[PDB]
Amino acid sequence: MKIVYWSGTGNTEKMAELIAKGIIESGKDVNTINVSDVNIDELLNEDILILGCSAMADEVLEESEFEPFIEEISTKISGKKVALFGSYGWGDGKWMRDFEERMNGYGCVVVETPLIVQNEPDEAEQDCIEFGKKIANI
């Protein structure tokens, strides 16, 4: 599988590595990929797209890298299974509700409840690992 994310301070990055760990512990292979190094064509071969990005102002996806990537793949992902995750600060997850709605709007099947944790995983570590285990059971 493949996990692509954007992280400004490393919070979502940590979530991505814990998610990968859960998938690996379940017996599968995963590659974590920062949005800046992703290859669209190779990404579209996946059955499951695992996407993450922290909440930027105001309750939107990061603008200079992550969103342009989402807009680029938006027309080629109809029918694909998608799993969403991300870290946030002071909000209540609105950027994630909208992120899920957008993906559904593109024709994607959102496989699980999006995983959101406030700031660094830390206490939510097992939650990150478990979310990866749910995805590996798809």
Ligand X SMILES: Cc1cc2nc3c(=O)[nH]c(=O)nc-3n(C[C@H](O)[C@H](O)[C@H](O)COP(=O)(O)O)c2cc1C
Site of interaction with ligand X (CB under 6 A): 7-12, 54-59, 87-91, 119
Angle at 79 between CA 78 and CA 85, to 5 degrees: 90
Cβ nearer to ligand X, comparing 68 with 89: 89
Exposure class string for 30-54: b at 16+ Cβ within 10 A, else e: bebbebeebeeeebeebebbbbbbb
Q: How far is the CB of 102 from ligand X (least distance, A)?
A: 16
Q: How far is the CB of 117 from ligand X (least distance, A)?
A: 8
Using the 8-state DSSP alphabet, how is residue 12 labeled?
H
Ramachandran angles phi, psi of 101, nearest 5°:
-60, -40
Q: Are 3 and 33 in contact (CB under 8 A)?
A: yes
Rounded to an integer, what distance in angstroms lies between the CA atom of residue 28 and that of residue 35? 22
Cβ nearer to ligand X, comparing 80 with 86: 86
Q: How far is the CB of 62 from ligand X (least distance, A)?
A: 8
Q: How far is the CB of 129 from ligand X (least distance, A)?
A: 17
